Amino acid sequence: MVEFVKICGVKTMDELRLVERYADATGVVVNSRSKRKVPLKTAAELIEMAEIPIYLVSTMKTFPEWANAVEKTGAEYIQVHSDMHPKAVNRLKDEYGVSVMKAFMVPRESDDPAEDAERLLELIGQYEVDKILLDTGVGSGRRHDYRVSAIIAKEYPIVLAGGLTPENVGEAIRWVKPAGVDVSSGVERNGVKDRVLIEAFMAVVRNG
Ligand SMILES: [Cl-]
Ligand code: NA
Helix, strand or coil, rough: CCCCCECCCCCHHHHHHCCCCCCCEEEEEECCCCECCCCHHHHHHCCCCCCCEEEEEEEECCCHHHHHHHHHHHHCCCEEEECCCHHHHHHHHHEEEEHHEEEEECCCCCHHHHHHHHHHHHCCCCCCCEEEEEEECCHHHHHHHHHHHHHHHHHCCCCEEEECCCCCCCHHHHHHCCCCEECHHEECCCEEECCCHHHHHHHHHHCC
């Protein structure tokens, strides 16, 4: 049983209200290399009208960048998609009172997933965050990424992310057994959050 579902990358009020009927959390992307990027003012509006937790999602690297974006948007939740220092992560929680989900890339430095898993756990232990997101990759290495993530998921209630779709999320869940899943383009139709795709995704998460 997955307890947490996040649909990331809402760009409009229409996409937000749709996602809110299904997801435990959503996210709005700023100051990042992303098709879902919106200006800070646009993110500030979605953050104000959201009725579920909405993450300010970004690859911003430095404290002043994050601090400016938190001041301008009023974000309560942030998703740090970068290797900003745990000390800088902690400064944001104390000085702005935000909850943090930290995203980690799944390393592919060994053919044995257990060794990539050991390296990943030592990086994760360096942070004090509400939530751990594991961002899985593509191609043939994806099966390796699931094997790594499955080891991590025994130690932390991780959120599994990366290329999830209605067609493949069932295998990802019973392979990795995460506490949560995160999906973006897998529930888009021509780049718009799509109700029928979301319902197909949720059916798998709730069924088995
Ligand atoms: Cl936190
Ligand atoms: Na705007």
